[PDB]
Every structure is written in structure tokens, then in C-alpha cells.
Amino acid sequence: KDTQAMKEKALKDVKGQIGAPMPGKVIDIKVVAGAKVAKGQPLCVLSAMKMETVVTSPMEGTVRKVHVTKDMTLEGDDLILEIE
Amino acid sequence: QNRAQKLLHYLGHVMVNGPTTPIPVKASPSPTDPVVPAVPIGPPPAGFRDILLREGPEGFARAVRNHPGLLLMDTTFRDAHQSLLATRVRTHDLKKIAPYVAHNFSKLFSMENWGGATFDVAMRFLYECPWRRLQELRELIPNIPFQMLLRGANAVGYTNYPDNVVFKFCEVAKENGMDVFRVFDSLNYLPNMLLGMEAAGSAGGVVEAAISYTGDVADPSRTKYSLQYYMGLAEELVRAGTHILCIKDMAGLLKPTACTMLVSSLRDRFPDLPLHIHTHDTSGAGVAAMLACAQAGADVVDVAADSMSGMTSQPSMGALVACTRGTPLDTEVPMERVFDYSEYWEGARGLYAAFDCTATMKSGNSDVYENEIPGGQYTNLHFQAHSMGLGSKFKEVKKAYVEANQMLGDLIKVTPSSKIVGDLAQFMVQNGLSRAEAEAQAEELSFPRSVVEFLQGYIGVPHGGFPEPFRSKVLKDLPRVEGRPGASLPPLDLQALEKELVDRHGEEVTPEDVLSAAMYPDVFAHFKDFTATFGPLDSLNTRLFLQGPKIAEEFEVELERGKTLHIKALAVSDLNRAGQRQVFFELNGQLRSILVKDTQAMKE
Amino acid sequence: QNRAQKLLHYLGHVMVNGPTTPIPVKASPSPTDPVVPAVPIGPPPAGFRDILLREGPEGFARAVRNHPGLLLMDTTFRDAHQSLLATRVRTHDLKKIAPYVAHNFSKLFSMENWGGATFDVAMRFLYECPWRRLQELRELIPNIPFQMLLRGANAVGYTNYPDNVVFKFCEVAKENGMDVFRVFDSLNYLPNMLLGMEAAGSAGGVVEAAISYTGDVADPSRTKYSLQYYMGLAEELVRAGTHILCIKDMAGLLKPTACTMLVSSLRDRFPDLPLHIHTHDTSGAGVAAMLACAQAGADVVDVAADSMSGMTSQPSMGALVACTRGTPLDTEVPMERVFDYSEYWEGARGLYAAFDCTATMKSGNSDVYENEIPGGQYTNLHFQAHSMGLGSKFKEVKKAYVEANQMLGDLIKVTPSSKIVGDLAQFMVQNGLSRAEAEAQAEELSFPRSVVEFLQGYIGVPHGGFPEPFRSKVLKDLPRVEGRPGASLPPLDLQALEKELVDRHGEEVTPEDVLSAAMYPDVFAHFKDFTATFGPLDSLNTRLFLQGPKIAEEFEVELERGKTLHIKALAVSDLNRAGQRQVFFELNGQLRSILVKDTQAMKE
Amino acid sequence: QNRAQKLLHYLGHVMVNGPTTPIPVKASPSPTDPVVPAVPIGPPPAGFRDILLREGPEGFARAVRNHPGLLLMDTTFRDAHQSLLATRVRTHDLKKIAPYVAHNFSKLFSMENWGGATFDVAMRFLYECPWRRLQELRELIPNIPFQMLLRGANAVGYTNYPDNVVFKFCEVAKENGMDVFRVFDSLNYLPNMLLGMEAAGSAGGVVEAAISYTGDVADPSRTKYSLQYYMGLAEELVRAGTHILCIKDMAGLLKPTACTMLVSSLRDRFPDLPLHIHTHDTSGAGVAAMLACAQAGADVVDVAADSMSGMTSQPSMGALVACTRGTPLDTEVPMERVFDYSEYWEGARGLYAAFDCTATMKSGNSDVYENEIPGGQYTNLHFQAHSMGLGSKFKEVKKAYVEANQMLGDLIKVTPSSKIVGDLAQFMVQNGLSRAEAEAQAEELSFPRSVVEFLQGYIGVPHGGFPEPFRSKVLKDLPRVEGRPGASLPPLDLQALEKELVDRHGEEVTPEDVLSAAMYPDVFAHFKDFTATFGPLDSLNTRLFLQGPKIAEEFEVELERGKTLHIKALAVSDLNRAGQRQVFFELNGQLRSILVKDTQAMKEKALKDVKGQIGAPMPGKVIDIKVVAGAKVAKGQPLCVLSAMKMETVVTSPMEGTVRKVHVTKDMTLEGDDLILEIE
Ligand SMILES: *C(=O)CCCC[C@@H]1SC[C@@H]2NC(=O)N[C@@H]21
Ligand SMILES: [Mn+2]
Ligand SMILES: [Mn+2]
Ligand SMILES: [Mn+2]
């Protein structure tokens, strides 16, 4: 673990998690941290090269926490949400 | 003291923060200057302007119809870069080759160098005055006629404005030295075209009514946009009085057999009416299609300099010239002349790497026949998918474009109809919606702005009507536009608007600025606002403009009004208290500095 | 695990030192995987090869003539990438869409997939056996005829070969799946193309004699490569007994009327003969030209997938399929399949960004009519000529490529003729010599090898001979040829090479290798040395082959079916005393590292 | 002001090329400035110089002798920093507390502030005039006597100078404010001392003859340098007519009993004679040894400011003052004053981090008892073994030093003799020669320059003699010096040297200068040439002098009698092709730029066209060498086979005749027009 460079974000990989498929700005705070997410519900909206994207879901259960803010730069896999 | 100051503050602001304008592809302006050929001193040879001003539009028209061999129009100064380089070409780079065109292309039917998106972006992304471009070119080319593209009822833009605005726009355009007005409407809505034609006509200057082309004429099993549709449309326009009739094929959907079928029929019906034809090369058949047009007896065809041609551009100027040597159809245009012209543009295009479509697009694509996306659009939507995405997200968008099209009634797709269908397309892919799913849920989905406005009547009436299964559900009784939008739309106070702009902008308001404000209220505000801070930027070369100078190289500024600034950029300091850097210049042998804020105290 | 140690060794070598082969344009292969369409199981539809196999070349010739409508050769597997991507396309990528081509293109006359520069480049740069490529695509495409480009006596090289080698080359090619041998000679020198013809005849392949085309047949004043010039040559080839006659337009010089002239006066001079017409699109007349050939009753035309066509390549297969619908000439190739094939090739094309000509060349150019530079060569000069000292004012290269033409007796510029003209101009570049300061300053100077060798008659006699006063002083006592190079050339001892190769380049070696080593003595040497060090890389993914793995990024590489290697690159160490870096990998969950040599840092 | 430009050209040269002086430790100065205690506005209290001026040296020595309690001489301004900070302390920093010492330290016997290493170090490294420093300090300290260290015949350099120049040195030194001349000779060699004494004598200053100390006088078994040895030597110097007598313990070798034994006995043979004892603290026995001297009745003791004491410097002032109170020895110096004096120096020291010996030396070392390296040498040799090399290679240097000392016949080691021993030690290690092995080979060894000059007697005759079987077969054919060197050395002109200084360095040349050029011909030359380019820099504060200004930092500077200069460094550009950088300053709010040269970037195959020579036709690898290197050629005959890729060029020649040399052999890539052959 790099403590020295733990002062950040996150890109949370393989297991059932929510990241950015497109590199863009963060616009939305749709779901509450701890709210019911049944069907394929929108959660987040990105904006790139004159574009806008709707962040998918196909996952059942409850949201852990939002990691994104507003007007946030997003890098790669990144940290939008977390479902269990 | 301010003038070179604002100029050094601009050049400084670039060096420290980078281009002030959006840089879509992350590449740098080419380091090698464009080769301008030698040009004879004195007057250019007789053109067609020498016959227009004297004999009048109807005489010009006659001379054109009588000219045995094939005539051409150069689109390099407009439609060409509007498709290949995002309309970014600046007045500076246009002027450098204007003299060469006057002296060597006297034989051109006309020269498209204005209208379409040039007006819009010159002010939005270039901070050049679109009118200044017009007059300065006009002063450098007396002999060849100037053609512009007029979006029928709305002049320049994508939304119908009051009728006086269009009628005055043309008056002024003509007085500033525009000759041929190519007038079209996205829907082929005859009332919207007539509006344009009248505004152009009554302003003096040649009226070229442009029929927008969709479908395939040589395919009889397609009945909506059939030969009998276009004939009849063309009937109505000729009856309404055209100087030159144009077939406008914005998407490159015009095949050879479909050509000679249509051109033969227009020649059938009107033996002595000048036919001007325009295509794009997206399908890879442009040259063949124009040669088929020429042979069926069309008078004029459009081309761009080889090095600014192909793909979503016009067919190669050289190809058209070459293929008619030793033919009754001969262009009589000397090939050396096209070589040197094309080689100028090879250099100029170089300067515009940041906007070059060949970042993503390496060739044309015959699938236009399926998707019907116009050249210009194809480039933008292509870039949007390949650039940020993973390549094959484009297949989905255009197969949703196809659906949006027949969803909205099977439309003719030019500006703004293509924006409308494209806006419906990108809507259906933000939410994984079938044509069948989306129109079964048409009642509530709350579609985008331009779609609801289209379905209301804001751009007029499509041939065939509106899709009434689908459209009523979207609208939930909103105020649908009755007749032609123009008349039922009170006139805009040009007098009032004059004074309105003055109390903040000043006494330095020419009547041209007014029409600019009338067309684009906001981007003209932001244009002057920028010009207020940095001065007129259209005198610099494009490398300097786009990327600023580089440390240690002396360069002279072609600053107008007869005074030359010698500048050598020396050094930028590192950041201070107030998150800025200090830029060091030599200015006419004097040591000078200014402060520019680094946008990094802006980033945390 | 020792076959995998070598793989790791290669992947480290790329990671440390950049790509092994010269990469001209400093760009990366795209991160997007090319889209391959789904294909139905079981056999493909029956193609022309079934008529060939069951009826011999004689029947195939007849069947092609009897097919009323226009037949096509897809050229994407060879010429298209030789022109646009410096012949770099690896087998891996060809093999992928091969099942698709098999199932969806049975209607093709043939597919060009071998010979030309692909032989040299495959071994020299791609470290692949070209014989493998042929056999492996053969197993995947049983129904479409394969087509080669053989340089006559020049074979797949740059100078003339002993008869026994050229003959033997065609035999084993036949036995590896070669169906059609397209035969041409750079100088149109009759005896030389008669050699390659019988050597192709003996093998039992379809013999396609090709007249190389220079000049303008439609131009009366050009009294060197006249309409009658070609007519004379054709009569001889038909009388020599070719199965199919081809016109090879290497530089894209055919204009629509020049086609109409030549193919009609050929059809009307040999009613029974299949006419195969080949062109490049560098001038932008390619489609129109080819459509004129079809109209004048050409049996077959050459095209390339849309995304691999245009500019210096072949004409769009989309366009000829499209422009031919609803016409006697209908190709009957479905448009939806043309889209898919092209779409795959866009994906593939991106993997080759570093070799893509469009980084410097953004369009075709009409000035081929001036510089007569062939498709392939118009790429390999400012994109290339990087090896000899880059490009710097390329205009001057060309304007002396034009002088070089007249300088060597005004020639048919193909391979290896054009190479010799392309070695003389580059020579004049770095030595800064004008044509006037060369014809006289001839004896007191030393030109390249290719020039000296051509002048003494190594690759044949040009039409009208050499330009004597110049020819004399270059050669100065050097021995001249005596007629047909092959005639007076001693046969190469192929059995003594056999035992050499076995004693040297590994033990058990194939007869194909003998023919590689014959064609290219030490390009084969360097190739066998490489694979011995690094193993067989043809199995490897292209992005993987060209730039290596992404650090931390897990991937799969199956060393040809059988086994699955899950690999992940981990880190690269600092430099050790011996100038090496250690490189760490995960191999099937197991930690593995190698010692590689850092080129840059190795100079002690 | 062309001399504002000269200031800037220097400041720019620093911040482009880094610390312009040799910078031994990779460290920068403190971002803090020394605390100067508040001072009274009037004239200072009357000190000893008032007595000296009124009574002469003979009177002054009486006043010293009669003072009941102990008198101190502060060495912070000279010896302290010579040991601790490679003598690097500049006039600027000394001037700052000059007013403070004047007012608060009137009781001091004298105040060592000149001579020894300061003379060349000022010019050689600090680029300032040592006379200017003396002069300026004299206007600042009217009341305390000044003291210098004078190396007898070697005056202020490292060998014997012509008689006349040594006398004239003392005259102009005296004339400048120099009161007390401490006069020693590295070998306690009387003639050289008498010379030094009558140089200072006839110049009018207080003469302090100084016996150099080695061995252990308390140790009966060590006969060579006995209490008798030293006793016989003082008696000579007293006969010669000294004012004060000094014991110079340069290595810190003096322990309590030995002091008690020596000073008490010197008090016996000379009842009322002022005894001035000087030691170094490098064995850790400095304070104690001095208290012993106090008790045995010494009149003056040498100390340094606390923050400049311990280790190889003098003993702590604070300690002697503290351990002396409430006794007849009492210095009567208030502790508050000592604290404050030291606190300034704690801060000043901080500026000299680049030169602080403490970077590798954190303690004294009792092994001085075995090796006997004087204070200054110890630390300026210890550094040499932990800095440019690492660690224990100093051990062997010390082991060789011990051996070298006895090789040269057991010597009193001070400058220059100590330098000699250290030069022979370095030599023996520099090529692995053990003592006995060096002895046998000395016949043809070729030793250092200073060692062979010594054995000729350029520096004189040591007590005992020259270790004989050695001396003879080193020199073998070289002139020796009999007796005193200065005796044969012709009186050096000082007016034909004046003419040259008028020539090389313009008209405005003082006589002070003359003696410097006499002392250090080449150091003075390099000195005067620096102050030509960059002007006088003795006015900058030390952080600015050594390190340059920080970017954006707004700072103040005055140039000797000229008004204030507000300055800001703004930026320093990239490199132009000439290898220069442009440096931008805000001068007086006005923007100014300077071109300066980048040293670090100053240290940054042939073609022949229009001649009979032959250049390569294309850029290519050489696969064949055809013509034998220098042989005949014919009409159009192949010479070289070149190959880039797919392109080859068989190199021909119409030029006939002989061939010169062959340039390239085999392999590596050759450029476009590159070197192949000449033909006659
Ligand atoms: C070398 O690496 C491959 C040869 C590339 C040159 C090609 S071969 C075919 C074209 N004709 C010619 O003379 N040069 C082009
Ligand atoms: Mn258009
Ligand atoms: Mn070809
Ligand atoms: Mn001392």
C-alpha cells in the first residue's frame, strides 16, 4: 500500500461495481447513498466531446455510497457508486 | 497604449494556458509554411463578374447556358473545409491565395466562399468578422462571381427569423459583393424557398433555387422521392423564376444512372435553363456522377482543390478537369494551375491538424446509401464516436439515425432537418430505445428541443405530412404552427436593435454588425467581448493564432494600418502569489512584459 | 514454457526498445478490437475455383467471358495495404475475415492475396513466412480463386532471376494454393513476360498477362505509348497464349475516354478474350475509369474494401457495386455485405496507424499525370525515404523523379523499373544535382546500384533503348547484357542451397524455405535468426506484436490452439551494469522474468 | 552605474551556474539572519588599546602583567573559523557584531582577527581585500587591541620570503590598525623568529614570540621536547626581547599537569613576564588545560564564542568565564554578554553550512595524542576522507602521518611543517608506500614539491637535524640552504613591482596592494580580475553572495557609499545556441535583463566537397573495404560498398594515383557526406 500516494481516487475493477465507461464531467446525484435500486435505473450522467451519457445499472439491491461530486473530472474505470 | 498590449496579452495567454478555442484532436499546427505561387501584377483576366454587372443576372444566366463546355465552381473557400476541417479556415489563409484565383481561375462559373456555417463559426470559434472576410476577398477578386449558401427562410443559422431580417440580410450581402445566392430548404418546403428566392432576387444578384436530393431516382420502387417528385418541384421553382436551378446532393446519394435520368429530364423540360449541380464524395462516386451530369447536359458542377477534396468533401477539381480534356466537355482550365492551387491548400490544411477529420476518418463509406447522413454531419458524428468511445459505437448511432428518419416521416436530411433527425438518434441511444419501443412510449418520453419544435411546424411541412400516429402523442396539444412560419412571426426592430448594441459596444457599429446580432445574439456578444480584450485577431497567421509564438524566434506582425510590430517571445516565469506567470517579450527592440493568469490557480 | 520463454523475451524486447522494425510515423495502434461478423457453419457457397478445378484454366477463362455482368477482384489482401499501409498487414488480421470472405464473396473473379511486396515485407518486417500465409488462408477459403502478382523474370524481387528459380517458384506456389498468376514486366519487355508466362503455364495456374500502362491513349500527340503500341503488344501475348489479358494501370493514369478507347478496340479485336483491368485511384478518376471499362465490355475490374480504398489504393468496391445496380453490368454483390467487409477493415486499418499514409497524405492528387509515380511508390517516399534522411521539400524530389524518367529513356514505371527511377531521384536529392548537372557530369560521378545494373541490361531492354550519351559514360567498360537476361543467366544450384540451409538454419527445412532463401538470401537469414531467438509470432495479436502489452493489463495469447497462456506484464527494472533491464510477468498465476538488452542505453 | 550591471552579472552568474566558489558540502545557507544585540549610541568603554597608545608596547605588557585576574583573547574572528568553516567568514558578517564587541568586550587582552589563512582565503575564495577588512574593523573597534598570527619568515604565505618584504608587511599592517603580532615558526628555529620579531619590533607593534608545542612535557621518557627544551627557547626569545610570551598549542596537546609544570616554571625564570597561552580543544582537554594555566599564573588565555568552540577550535569562552568566577582568576566578563555574543555567531555560523566541518566531524578526538595533526589540518583532511571519498581511508592517512612525522625526524607540526608531513602522508598512501619501503626507494621515488624543498632548508633547520640517511639520497644533486633562508634571498623590489601593478590593473593601486601581489602574485591577479568583472562584492550579505537571490524575492543592497538598490529576480530563460541564458530582474521597479553564460552547458566524421576529396554518395553501412589502406586506383574503379536498406552504392573514382589514409573500417552507420578517401 502506497501511503505516501494515498492522498487522492478509485477505479474498482472486476466485481459488481459502478464506474465511468466514458471520460467526462459528473453532472448527477440521482440515487441516495443507501437507496433502493431495483431495475435498470439511471444513476449518473457524463459529458464528453459535445456528448452526454446515461450511466447504466443492471444490478439489484442497495447502494453503498456515491463517490462522485459535481463538475468532477473522471479518469478511467473510476468511482461512481457501489451496490450489494 | 492598448493595441499591441492586448495582442501581447493574447499571445501570452496562449503560451501559458494553450488555445482559447476548443482543440478536439490533440495535435499541433504544422511547422512548414504554405507555398503561395507567383502571380502577375495588375488586373486579372475577364471573369463572369464582368458579364454580370453589365448584362444582369438573366444575361449571366444566358451566357452560362450558352457556354458549350463544362463550367465549375470551387468550394474550397467554404463547403470543403466545413466538411473536412470543421469550418475553421480563417480569412488570413483565404486571402493569401485570392490573387492566384483571380488570375488563374477566371473561367469559374462562381466561387463559394460564404454562407452555411462560415458565418456562425467565424464569430464563435475564430473571432473574425464574417463580413470582413467578404469585403477583403471581394477586393482581391473582382472577376469571378461570389456564391453563398442561403438556408432558405433563415438566411444563416438553423431557425426561421422574421421576414425583413432575411430580406435585409441579402440586400447587404449583395452590396458587400455577394453575387450568386444558392437557396435551399431542409424540407423542400416551397413557401420557405420562395421566401429565400424573393429576399435574394429583390436584392439583385443571381437566384439559384436548390432542390435537396434524397432517395434514388433510378430506383423506381422508391416512390416518395421519385423522379416525378423532383420534376414538379423543379417545375414550381422555374415558374416562380429562377436564374439558375441547382440540384443539391448534400449526402452524395447521386449515382450516374440516377444523374443522366434527372439531368436529361430537366434538360427535357427546360432546354435553355442553366443547371448547376452539387454533390459530396462520401460514396466514392462524385466524379463519376458529375461526369454523367455533364454528359446529360448540365452547365455547372462543383469541385474542390484535390488536396481539399474526396471523402465528405466535393469531388477533386483535378479529376473533373482531367477527365474532360479532349472532350466537347473540356473545362479549358489549365492543369498546372490546378496543381499549384491544390498544393497551396496542402500547406494550409497542414495548419489545421487540430481539426482534421483524418484523425479518425481515413476514407469515404458507401453506406451513405443506407443512412443518408449528409457529408458535414457524417464527419462530426464519426469523430464523436471514434474519438471518445470505442469505434463501433458509431454503427449503433447510424442504425438509429436510419430509424429516427422513418420515425419522423422519412425526411429530406439537410440542415436543420439533419440536426433534428440526428438529435432524435442520439436520444434513442442514451436509453436503448427501439423505433418501436420509443414510439409506443411516444406519449411521455419528453424528447429533445429541436424534435418537438420540428413536429410543431417551426421548420415547416415535410412532403407526405407528419407521422400522425407518432407526432400527436409527443405534442400533447401545444401551439402548432399554422402556415409558413415567416408571415405569422412579427418583424424584428432593426432600428431598436441598433441602439441596443451601442451603449455597451460603441459608436464603432456598422450596419453589418446589426444583422450579425439579429442572427446570433449571443455569439456576437461573446465575439465583441473577446475582441474588446484582445483586439482584432484576423491579421495574424494561423500558427500564431492557434498556438502562439515559440521562445526565441523573431516574427513580424502583419498588423493593419501601416505599422509593423517586431516581436520575439523570450521567456515565461513560474507562478507567483496570484497564480499567474510573467511573459517576457522583445517589442521593436524594447524589453517588455505582461502578466497572464495561469488556469491552475483556476484548477485548485 | 520454453516456447513461452521466447515469447516473454520478445514482449520484453518491444516494451523496452519500442517496436523492432522501423516505425516511420510516431503513432500508436488503436485500442479498439476490429469487428468480425458472424458466419454460418459448414461449407461456403461454390465459387469460381470449383469451375477452375473441374474445368482447368481454359474453362475458367470461358466462364468468366460468359458471365455477362461485371466481375470483381477484391484487392484488400495485397495491393490495398501495399499502397496505404506500407504492406504491413499481418496474417493474423488477414486470417480473421477469411471465413467471411469465403462465405459472402463467392462471386469474385479472384482475390489478390499474394506476391508484390508482401513476400519481402512479411519476412523482413513482420517476421512471418509468406508461404504460411498462402497455405493458411487457402484452408479458410476453398471456393474463391487466389491471385498472385508475379514480376515476370523479377518474380517477387527487384532484379532478374535464373529461369529454373522462376519456374520452380510457380510450381510450389501452385501446390500451396495459387490459382491465378498475374504476370507483368516493368519495361513491357516482351521476352521477359513470355518467361513468366510459360513458367506460370507449366505450373498449371491461370495465366494472366498484364500490359503495364503509361501515357494517355486518348491523347493523339503522344507518339511513344500509342493506342497501337498496346495493340501490338496484346496481339503477341494472345498469340503466346495467355488465358486472360490484363491492363495494369499502376499509377492510376487511365481516364474514362482512354478506357473506352482501349477496351472497346480490344473487345472488338479479341471477342473471346477475358479482359481484366487494374487501376489506382490516386488521380480520383478510378471509379469513373473502371465504369467506362465495364461499359466497353471489360469482364473484370479491381476494387478494394471502402475503408482500404481511395487515394493511392484501388477504387471503392462500394462504389462499383453501387453504381452498377439496375444495369446490365450489375455485380449482384449485396450492399449489406460490402458494408460489413469494409467495417472490419476500418477496425483493422487502425491497428496500423504507425504505417498509415494519411498522416502526411490526406487525399489523392491529380499531379500523377506529371510525376507518374505508382500507387505503392507515392506512399513510400515522404511517408518513407525516412531511412536515407527523411523528407525535406518533397516537391524537388518529384520534379526530378520527372527528370529521372526522361533521364533513363522515358519509361514504363513499375517494379522494379520505378524503384530504379526512385533511386535516381533520391540520389539527386542528397547530392543536390539537376538534370543538366548530371547528363554531362555523368562519368565523373557514381550513381546507385539499381541504376548501373539496369543500364547494363540486368532487367531487360526498354522500348526504344537507353539514352546512349548518358548510358555510355555511366557504365564505362562495365559488361552489357546480350538479350534476355534469363537466357544468358546461369541456373542457380537449388540442391546445393538445400544442404546449406539444413546445415545452417535449423535441421529439418521445407522446400518453400529454399525458394525464400533463393529470392532473398539474407532477408531469409535474418528472419530465421529472429524466430529462433523469439519463436513464431504470426500467432500473435497485432497491437501486441507492434507495441507489446500494457503494464498491469491481463491478456491471452494461445500459441496456436492447443494451449492457453494467460499473461500480464508487471514492471521493468532500472538498468544494470551490463546495460540490461529485468522484466516481470505473471504467467498462469506464476511469476516469471527475463533479461533483455536496452538498445538506446547500450552504447559502451 | 556600470557597477549595477556588474552586480547583476554576478548574481545572474550564480543563479545559473550555482555556488561560484568551491562548495564542499552539498548544503545551502540558513533562511534566517543573525541576531545582532542592541548597542549603546556613544563611544565604547576604554579598553587596552588606550593603554597601548599612551604607554607603548613596553607599557602595555606591564598593564597586562599587573592585571590580577585572567585576561582573554577572543579568536572567533580568525582561528575559530579557520578550523571550523575553512576560513570562509567574510567581512560583512564580522562587521555586524563589531560594534557589539567594542562596547561589551573592552576587557579582552587583544582580539585575533587577521593573518594566518585569512589573507589568501579573503582574496582566493571570498574575493575581498584583507586590508579592507582590517581597515573597516579598525574604524568599528577603536578600543580593543587587534592581534594577528604571523608565520615568522613565511610571513603570511607558506615559504620564506625576502627579508625586506617581511619588514614592510609589518609596517603597513601596523599603519592599518594592527597592534599585536603573534610571531611563530613551524620548526622552533630561532633565526626565523628573531627575523619576525624585528619585523614587528621596528614597525612599533606589540611583539609576541610564540613557542610551538609538541609531545608531552609531563612525560619524563619523551626527551626530545623536554621542559628544558622549551625553557632554553623562551630564554633565547626573552634575550631577543619579546613583550608577551606565548605557548602555541596548535594541535590541542596540552594537558593540566603539563600546563602546571610548564607555566609555573616559566613564571619562575621570568617573574613578571606576560604569558599568553593558546590551545585547541581537539582532545577534549582545552578548558581544563587553560584553568591549569590560570592557576599556574598565566595572564592571557585564548577562547572562542561558544557556538564557535569545542572540537578543533579554541575552548569555549562561556566555560572559562563561568569556571573562573568567585576565584582570584575571575575574568569579570558578564555572562549575559557571552550568551549574546555566542548567539549572534550561532546564526552567522548557520550561513556557512556549505563549509561546516561538523557535516562529518561531530566530536573531538583524543587520538591527536598519537598522530598530532594541528586543529585546522585535522578537520581539513578529515573532510577529505568522508566527502570526496568515504569513511576509513582517513585511517591510513593518519597512520601515514604518524610515520611521515618520524620519517622527517620527529617534527613540530604547524604551518608549513604540518603541511609537509601531510603531503608525505598523502604521497605514501597515493601509491601504497610503507615507511620502511619508502625509505629504501627514496633514491628514485620522486616525492612531493613541498617535501623536497623542506630538506633543502627553504623553511630552515629543525631541532635535532635532518633524518640523515634519508635527506642525502633524496637531494643528491640539489642546492641546500645553509642556516637561515632570508639571509641569501635577495631583497625583493617593491617599486618595479609597483610599475607592473600600474600596468596590469589601472592607476588606482594602493601600497597595501603591492604587498599582496608580493605575497600572492597569482591569487592577487585572479582576485583583481574578478572584481573587474563583477565589481566589489564585499557589501552583499553572505546568503546572496554564495547562493544568489531566490526567484520573486524582493531584496536590498548598497554598494560602498552609493545609495540603496531595490532588486527582484524575476526569471531565467532557456538556453540560446551560444549556450547563454537571459536573466530578468526588476531593478528599481524598472525591468532589466542580463545575458549570462551557462558553464554546465558550455561543455556541450568529416565532409569535403569542392576539392579532390571524396564524400559518400548515400548514407549507408560499410560492408566491403576494397582498396588496401593507401594503394593505387584506376579509371572508374570500385573502392567501397555501401548499403542503407534495399539501396546500395558501389563507390567509384575517375581520380587516379596514390591513396592517403583509410577513414572507416567495418559496420557502423555512415551519414550522407562522410569521410572515405583522398587521392593524390
Ligand atoms: C521494402 O521494404 C519493400 C519494397 C517497397 C517498395 C515497393 S515494391 C512495389 C512498389 N514498386 C516499387 O518500385 N517500389 C514499391
Ligand atoms: Mn454541400
Ligand atoms: Mn497495383
Ligand atoms: Mn590555533
Short mmCIF file of C-alpha atoms in Angstrom, two decimals, chain C residues 120 124-125 158 387-388 419 423 426-427 430-431 444-449 476, chain D residues 616-619 635-636 644-652 654 671-673:
data_model
loop_
_atom_site.label_atom_id
_atom_site.label_comp_id
_atom_site.label_asym_id
_atom_site.label_seq_id
_atom_site.Cartn_x
_atom_site.Cartn_y
_atom_site.Cartn_z
CA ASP C 120 9.65 -9.30 -48.90
CA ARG C 124 11.76 -8.57 -43.39
CA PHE C 125 9.39 -6.70 -41.08
CA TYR C 158 13.88 -6.36 -57.80
CA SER C 387 15.85 5.59 -43.95
CA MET C 388 18.08 7.73 -46.21
CA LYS C 419 12.36 1.71 -58.00
CA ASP C 423 16.68 5.55 -56.61
CA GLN C 426 16.69 10.31 -54.23
CA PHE C 427 20.33 10.21 -55.36
CA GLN C 430 21.06 14.27 -51.15
CA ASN C 431 23.66 15.23 -53.76
CA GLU C 444 32.91 11.88 -63.08
CA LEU C 445 30.19 10.54 -60.73
CA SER C 446 28.83 7.30 -59.16
CA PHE C 447 25.07 6.59 -59.35
CA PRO C 448 23.26 3.89 -57.29
CA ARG C 449 23.50 0.15 -57.99
CA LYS C 476 32.42 2.93 -68.82
CA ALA D 616 29.84 9.34 -49.59
CA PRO D 617 27.02 9.23 -52.20
CA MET D 618 24.25 7.95 -49.88
CA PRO D 619 24.01 7.36 -46.10
CA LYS D 635 39.76 4.97 -64.12
CA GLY D 636 36.34 4.28 -62.56
CA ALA D 644 21.25 1.62 -46.37
CA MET D 645 18.19 -0.58 -46.95
CA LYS D 646 17.31 -2.00 -50.41
CA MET D 647 19.74 0.66 -51.73
CA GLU D 648 23.44 0.05 -52.45
CA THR D 649 26.21 2.24 -53.86
CA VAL D 650 29.48 0.90 -55.32
CA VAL D 651 31.81 3.91 -54.74
CA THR D 652 33.78 4.78 -57.93
CA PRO D 654 37.83 8.77 -62.00
CA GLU D 671 25.97 9.77 -42.78
CA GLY D 672 25.27 11.49 -46.13
CA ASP D 673 28.53 13.29 -46.89
#
